[PDB]
Amino acid sequence: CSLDQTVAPGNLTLCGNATLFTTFRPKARFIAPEGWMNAPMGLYQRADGSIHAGYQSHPKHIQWGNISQGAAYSSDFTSWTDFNGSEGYKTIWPSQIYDIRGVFDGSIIKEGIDGYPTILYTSTSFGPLGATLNEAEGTETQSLAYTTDDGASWIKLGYGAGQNPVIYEWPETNLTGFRDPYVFQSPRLEALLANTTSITNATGDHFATISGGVHGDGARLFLYRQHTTGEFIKWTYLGPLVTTGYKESYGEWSGNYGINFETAGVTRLNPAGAAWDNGSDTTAVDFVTFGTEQGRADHQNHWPLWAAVDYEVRDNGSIEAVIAYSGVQDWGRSYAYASFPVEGYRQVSVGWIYEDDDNVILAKQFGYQGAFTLFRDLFVKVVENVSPSTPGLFEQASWSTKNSTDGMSVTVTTLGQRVVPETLAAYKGNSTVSTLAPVMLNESAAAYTPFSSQPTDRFYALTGSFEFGLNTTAKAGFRVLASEEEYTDIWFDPASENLTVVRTASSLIKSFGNDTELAKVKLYEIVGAESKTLNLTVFVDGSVIEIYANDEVALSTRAYPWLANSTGAGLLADGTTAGDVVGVSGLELWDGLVDAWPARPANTSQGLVWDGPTAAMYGLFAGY
């Protein structure tokens, strides 16, 4: 095993465990110290204002198993510190008959058991578990634990009658899944149900959704309500909140609803951020965010979606969330988005970016798998004075339209996402910032034009505004992680409305994924404008490429170039002419970003272990 990044890569499968630990590793984002991670969990703002982030964790392994909560904290979403206790950076782990198969996703009741922060999580036991298997009741239940030390440790309620698990009965038969309890307060839902509480007797101030579906009949999000305020054992099933069809799709802008939901959450937003009104705010919109399974041919069969919903009260004292419009939270290799409330009327969302090594060829050599996305403020994005001749505008697919009185302009409403400002400020302030001169892309434009200043490593951010003619057929964007032989191309093509990431040349190492990523982006044309603009922000962080367009469209993906000098970046141009020009302005390179884990050394591997021959006997975990 040679680690010479000045020549072509050898057979890297001969390299030892964690020998490629630093080679492709993100430095500027949330990631476990080592080993396997997946979904964010247990997210909450602590009493001191800091952020507690949990995650599904399997230390010293590179596949899922014995799934536990790893945890860390931060005062700014950006610079983090690991917890360190008797189980290292773990704070909840399989320990009881009811959760021995895995401590799955859970969410936080801030004022819970004895007034302490309390997690409601999916406790798993034995038996077939999965949307395509014949799962039985009891395999997935929901259990409580609380912390007396601000997340350094958690104490589970005892096992038994009137204790853990607290939710165990399936609300309907033949479930495809029954997990990921999302606990939330909702003045909105309380107001809607206030006249029906005699029917159910559920009067608590916390609601909980559980994600799943029904075999052969599509996904389901089940709504529970805390039976009595201040009491956390009894949760009353109201009814299905979201019901979708078996592999139903709302269309090209909306992914596919698959057969089963995972990590679903419920929020209410307005243009500024989180909305906590009872329905009285006419600018507020109710949203559900959710993953779906088995409705996608690639990306691990997983869509991270969202939907704007209108709540209707059923006669039995439950709520139907009727989907008004439906979109995609991220178009690339990410999933398991969780959102949580943050002080100052914010709702912040974060997901998991998986690797692109689905055949597990170099996972052991990495010594880790997975990272988070960046943390994102959610809000209602409102675009005013939109031209009615914007192509496809009245499809109203992942947005809504309201006509002006005179019919000459439209107000567009959709889900907004933007990187939390704490991270943008810290990134910029710790980077070497190059403000670049605007570039007009015309007949003289090369295919690729390097920026006048270049990155020094694989940790940087790019921004640019691309102004296109209303009838352009030109394409433009950014090339990143680029040398002569390796590069990743991010293109926008207004004619097709497609943002793509072409990865055919991303790496000389042939075992990584190389499929082209694709997102739809609607450039809402403004009344009186003779052009349309794409604002593109790109974060390059080890192997992560995370793309944001117009504070709306997100696409996370992976690139693993071998050569040490595959770090360059610049502008891409295709079919730009004297007549069909693309004006690029607001160009800026931030080189360096932030060291997100300042207390960690460069190599936090502790080696990898094998569970031994019993792993196959038990049949629950891969074992490595």
Ligand X SMILES: *[C@@H]1O[C@H](CO)[C@@H](O)[C@H](O)[C@H]1NC(C)=O
Ligand Y SMILES: *[C@@H]1O[C@H](CO)[C@@H](O[C@@H]2O[C@H](CO)[C@@H](O[C@@H]3O[C@H](CO[C@H]4O[C@H](CO[C@H]5O[C@H](CO)[C@@H](O)[C@H](O)[C@@H]5O[C@H]5O[C@H](CO)[C@@H](O)[C@H](O)[C@@H]5O)[C@@H](O)[C@H](O[C@H]5O[C@H](CO)[C@@H](O)[C@H](O)[C@@H]5O)[C@@H]4O)[C@@H](O)[C@H](O[C@H]4O[C@H](CO)[C@@H](O)[C@H](O)[C@@H]4O[C@H]4O[C@H](CO)[C@@H](O)[C@H](O)[C@@H]4O[C@H]4O[C@H](CO)[C@@H](O)[C@H](O)[C@@H]4O)[C@@H]3O)[C@H](O)[C@H]2NC(C)=O)[C@H](O)[C@H]1NC(C)=O
Ligand Z SMILES: OC[C@H]1O[C@](O)(CO)[C@@H](O)[C@@H]1O
Ligand U SMILES: *[C@@H]1O[C@H](CO)[C@@H](O[C@@H]2O[C@H](CO)[C@@H](O[C@@H]3O[C@H](CO[C@H]4O[C@H](CO)[C@@H](O)[C@H](O[C@H]5O[C@H](CO)[C@@H](O)[C@H](O)[C@@H]5O)[C@@H]4O)[C@@H](O)[C@H](O[C@H]4O[C@H](CO)[C@@H](O)[C@H](O)[C@@H]4O[C@@H]4O[C@H](CO)[C@@H](O)[C@H](O)[C@@H]4O)[C@@H]3O)[C@H](O)[C@H]2NC(C)=O)[C@H](O)[C@H]1NC(C)=O
Residue numbers in the known binding site for beta-D-fructose are: 38, 64, 105, 179-180, 262
- Of 358-387, binders to ligand U (CB under 6 A) are 364
Per-residue x/- mask for ligand X, residues 474 to 493, rule CB under 6 A? ---------xx---------
Across the strands, what pairs with 54?
41, 71
Residues in 38-67 that interact with ligand Y by CB under 6 A? 66
The token pair at 461 is: 């951010």
Report strand pairing: 368-369 vs 35-45.
Answer: parallel
Name the one range near ligand X by CB under 6 A: 154-162, 204-212, 423-431, 454-462: 423-431
Please count the residues of this chain forming the interface with ligand U, following the rule CB under 6 A. Answer: 11
- With CB under 6 A as the contact rule, which of the stretches 45-53, 307-315, 401-409, 608-616 interacts with ligand U? 608-616
Please compute, for residue 157, the number of CA atoms within 13 A of its CA located in the half-sphere on the CB side: 22
Rounded-to-integer distance, Cα 371 and Cα 245, Å: 31
C-alpha to C-alpha distance for 5 and 26, rounded to whole angstroms: 18
Q: What is the DSSP letter of 423?
A: H
**Partner in contact with 381, chosen from ligand Y, ligand Z, a second copy, none, beta carbon below 5 to 8 Å by kind:** none
Q: Is 68 in the site for ligand Y (CB under 6 A)?
A: yes
Beta bridge partners of residue 544, listed in sequence order: 541, 558
Pick from 451, 440, 404: which is nearest to 567 by CA?
451
Least spacing, CB of residue 185 vs ligand Y, in Å: 22
Contacting range for ligand Y; rule: CB under 6 A; set: 154-162, 304-312, 430-438, 552-560: 154-162
Residues within window 111-150 making contact with ligand Y, judged by CB under 6 A = 113-114
472 Cβ contact list (under 8 Å, min separation 6): 494, 495, 580, 582
Cα 113 from chain centre = 29
Q: Which of 231, 252, 298, 457 contacts ligand X by CB under 6 A?
A: 252
Nearest CB to ligand Z, comparing residues 56 and 506: 56
> Using the rule CB under 6 A, which residue among 47, 48, 86, 134 binds ligand X?
134
Beta bridge partners of 118: 109, 146
Query: CB atoms < 10 A from the CB of 344, how many?
Result: 8
Can you name the residues that pair with 346 across neighbouring β-strands? 342
Using CB under 8 A, list all residues that contact a second copy: 66, 94-95, 97-98, 100-101, 125-126, 136-138, 141, 159-163, 165, 168-169, 609-614, 617-618, 620
Q: Pick from ligand X, ligand Z, a second copy, none: which does 484 bind, CB < 5 to 8 A by kind?
A: ligand X
174 — alpha (psi -120 to 50), left (phi > 0) or beta?
left
Phi then psi for residue 379, to 5 deg, are -160, 170
Distance in Å, CB of 182 to ligand Z, minimum: 11
In terms of CB distance, is 97 or 446 closer to a second copy?
A: 97
First vs last C-alpha separation in the chain: 22
Binding part of the chain for ligand X, among 7-15, 59-67, 340-348, 467-475 by CB under 6 A, reads 7-15
Q: Write each residue from 90 to 109 as x if it is in contact with ligand Y (CB under 6 A), else as -, in one continuous string.
A: x--xxxxx------------
Element (H, E) at 421: helix 421-430
Indicate which single residue of 397, 439, 554, 555 sits in contact with ligand X (rule: CB under 6 A).
439
The binding site comprises 38, 64, 105, 179-180, 262
Cβ pair 59, 369 in contact under 8 A = no
Return residues touching ligand Y (CB under 6 A): 66, 68, 85-87, 90, 93-97, 113-114, 155-156, 158-159
